């Protein structure tokens, strides 16, 4: 089925591969070559997860966990049950994620819009590969990657963080957190503002964008503008994820001690390093 206004957009063209061979829809979904690829990787990856569940002996989704190879395996292959399934599933997940982004591109072309969406999705993919590929390789073993399990992958976060004391002191970690908080702050304000203008008080006409500007100037003395806030949200969310991959790519590769020690440079500067008093005196 179609939306009332959708037919005029369902024209041929825009594909990157296969011409018109895969240029069609299934219900609302556009297929395309990379829609087929996505389905192939996704189906294969899910079969291997079910397979890993059989080997594990449970079908409870809360208990299923596909672990990567043991550290002793280094960066070589491992048997399916001893980490090989994690390796193949990791290949499939990458195939699925990338195929998804190239599918979005074909949809951008057919609709004649910009490519901002798949470009933004590529940041989330980069963060994923930072944890399963870039960092394990730089450290020398797939075992440093995180396991595919609802709860076991939370334990990996906790075990990895506490290996370096309180991960809070990771300075790139602080920056990434600031962007996550600021982004949620900005998302809440932006959604509230449009709705407050489109749904004014009872007995009122719909407001104008000038009211949005006036409200925020009255509040904090500045309005970033209708276009600026969408630039800002895109930037806050991507920067959050950029500094996330950054705070990890450096953990265990160029930094190995507790992250609180990183801050001792500022403290023990030879001039005020020895002054009596204070917290560090």
């Amino acid at each position: 089925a179609l939306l009332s206004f959708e037919r005029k957009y369902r024209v041929p063209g825009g594909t990157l591969v296969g011409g018109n061979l895969f240029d069609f829809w299934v219900g609302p979904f556009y297929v395309g070559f990379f829609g087929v690829a996505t389905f192939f990787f996704a189906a294969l990856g899910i079969i291997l997860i079910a397979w890993s569940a059989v080997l594990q002996g449970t079908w409870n989704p809360q208990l299923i966990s596909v672990y990567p190879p043991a550290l002793e395996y280094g960066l070589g292959g491992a048997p399916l049950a001893k980490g090989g399934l994690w390796q193949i599933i990791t290949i499939c997940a990458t195939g699925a994620f990338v195929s998804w982004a190239l599918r979005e591109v074909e949809i951008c072309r057919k609709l004649g819009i910009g490519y901002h969406i798949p470009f933004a999705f590529a940041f989330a993919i980069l963060a994923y590969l930072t944890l399963v590929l870039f960092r394990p390789v730089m450290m020398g073993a797939w075992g440093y990657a995180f396991p595919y399990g609802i709860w076991t992958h939370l334990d990996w976060v906790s075990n990895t963080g506490y290996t370096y004391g309180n991960f809070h002191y990771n300075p790139a970690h602080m920056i990434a957190i600031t962007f996550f908080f600021t982004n949620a702050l900005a998302l809440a304000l932006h959604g509230a503002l449009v709705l407050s203008a489109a749904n004014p008080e009872k007995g009122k006409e719909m407001r104008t964008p000038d009211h949005e500007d006036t409200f925020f100037r009255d509040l904090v003395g500045y309005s970033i503008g209708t276009l600026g806030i969408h630039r800002l949200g895109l930037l806050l969310s991507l920067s959050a994820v950029f500094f996330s991959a950054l705070c990890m790519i450096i953990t265990g590769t160029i930094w190995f001690d507790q992250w609180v020690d990183w801050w001792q440079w500022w403290v023990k500067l030879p001039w005020w390093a020895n002054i009596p008093g204070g917290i560090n005196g």
Partner: protein, 300 residues
């Protein structure tokens, strides 16, 4: 291809003094200077700003909270400026010791000053909340902003006021300090058996992650259809244009469903407020009802 991330050609005209409606124009400042720097990314105009009793009260109360922490930090530094800058992130204004319970009798150096600062922060935040309401009201707008702000206040209230009271001791509140309140956060999880296994904490993470997901989707979507004037979302709500249609169809073709120009902003406001709404619930239950989230989790 031009991506519309930074303005190519800035234009400037007479300052916009803004809508009037029922705003008391007596409390509006003059217009500030234009910022070509900001002009590359958003609007270049600074000001005017509305300054009323609540704003003056919030602003003054906020500075007092800031100054109270400040002179505590100078006191911890022995009034030495060098020590002050060196140990700035290490200073901390701690709440009263558990012995004082919920009493305001703690000496200044023993948590009394933390109580004074918290009072000023309490007045500053709540007078600022009433400000987000009255500014929308003066322009005849909905109060969505004030209600979204309540969600953030709710977590802030739980962390430093509601939960400590229910625990019966101000010592359970958070300290004022850069590193000290990071340390407080870590100890809180260890004491309560791993917050990873607090379901309201996991929900809070899902909406935090989801907020970055949704704003990247929405920001990227609007920029992709800004070639059709898609950022003029209010008129797109009143008169759907090809921008709203292409934006909706991109997501329909991609994941099987879509939003409207208005409806996506209800997804956004709820995605964001749910972060602190569920978070405050999780914190409120820690120690009052549940002492160990991992152990509690094994039975559910």
């Amino acid at each position: 291809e031009y991506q519309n991330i930074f303005t190519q050609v800035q234009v400037r005209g007479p300052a916009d003094l803004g809508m009037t409606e029922d705003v008391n124009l007596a409390n509006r400042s003059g217009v500030g200077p234009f910022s070509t720097l900001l002009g590359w990314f958003g609007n270049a105009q600074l000001g005017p700003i509305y300054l009323g009793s609540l704003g003056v009260l919030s602003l003054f109360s906020g500075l007092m909270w800031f100054f109270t922490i400040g002179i505590w930090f100078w006191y911890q530094a022995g009034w030495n400026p060098a020590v002050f800058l060196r140990d700035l992130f290490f200073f901390s204004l701690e709440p009263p010791a558990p012995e004082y319970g919920l009493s305001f009798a703690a000496p200044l150096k023993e948590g009394g000053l933390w109580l004074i600062a918290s009072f000023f922060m309490f007045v500053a935040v709540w007078s600022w909340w009433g400000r987000t309401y009255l500014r929308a009201q003066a322009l005849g707008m909905g109060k969505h902003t004030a209600w979204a702000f309540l969600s953030a206040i709710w977590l802030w209230m739980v962390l430093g006021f509601i939960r400590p009271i229910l625990m019966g001791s101000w010592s359970e509140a958070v300290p004022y300090g850069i590193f000290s309140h990071l340390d407080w956060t870590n100890n809180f999880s260890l004491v309560h058996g791993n917050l990873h296994y607090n379901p309201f904490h996991g929900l809070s993470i899902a909406f935090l992650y989801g907020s970055a997901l949704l704003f990247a989707m929405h920001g990227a979507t609007i920029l992709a259809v800004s070639r059709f004037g898609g950022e003029r979302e209010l008129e797109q709500i009143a008169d759907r244009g090809t921008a709203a249609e292409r934006a909706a169809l991109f997501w329909r073709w991609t994941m099987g469903f879509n939003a409207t120009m208005e409806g996506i902003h209800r997804w956004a406001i709820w995605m964001a407020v749910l972060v602190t709404l569920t978070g405050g619930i999780g914190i409120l239950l820690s120690g009052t009802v549940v002492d160990n989230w991992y152990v509690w989790g094994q039975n559910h």
